[PDB]
């Protein structure tokens, strides 16, 4: 699963979490067995303005 968020929201990508992203965008199960990888994409996905 791939997507883009902002850094302050990375804490929501974890099992048993709640928030705008976890509740309304992307929810991980409590028994999730896997990995979460994230990297800063400022040079690619950020635009002036």
């Amino acid at each position: 699963d791939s997507f883009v968020i902002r850094g302050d929201e990375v804490r929501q990508i974890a099992p048993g979490q709640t928030g705008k992203i976890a509740d309304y965008n992307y929810k991980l199960p409590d028994d999730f067995t896997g990995c979460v990888i994230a990297w800063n994409s400022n040079n690619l996905d950020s635009k002036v303005g």
Binding site: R6, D8, E9, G16, Q17, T18, G19, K20
Partner: protein, 50 residues
């Protein structure tokens, strides 16, 4: 206030919704001990200090 002179405010006789605070990216740190930050709306409190 300064950290050595930390200010304490008593909060009572008021309903509050800690779900709009945990869902806020403005707060760089939101960590709770002894009670989950998610399950907060059900809990009923008798003495709140800030």
């Amino acid at each position: 206030a300064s950290v050595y002179a930390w200010n304490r405010k008593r909060i009572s006789n008021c309903v509050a919704d800690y779900s709009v605070l945990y869902n806020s990216a403005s707060f760089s740190t939101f960590k709770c001990y002894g009670v989950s930050p998610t399950k907060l709306n059900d809990l009923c409190f008798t003495n709140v200090y800030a």
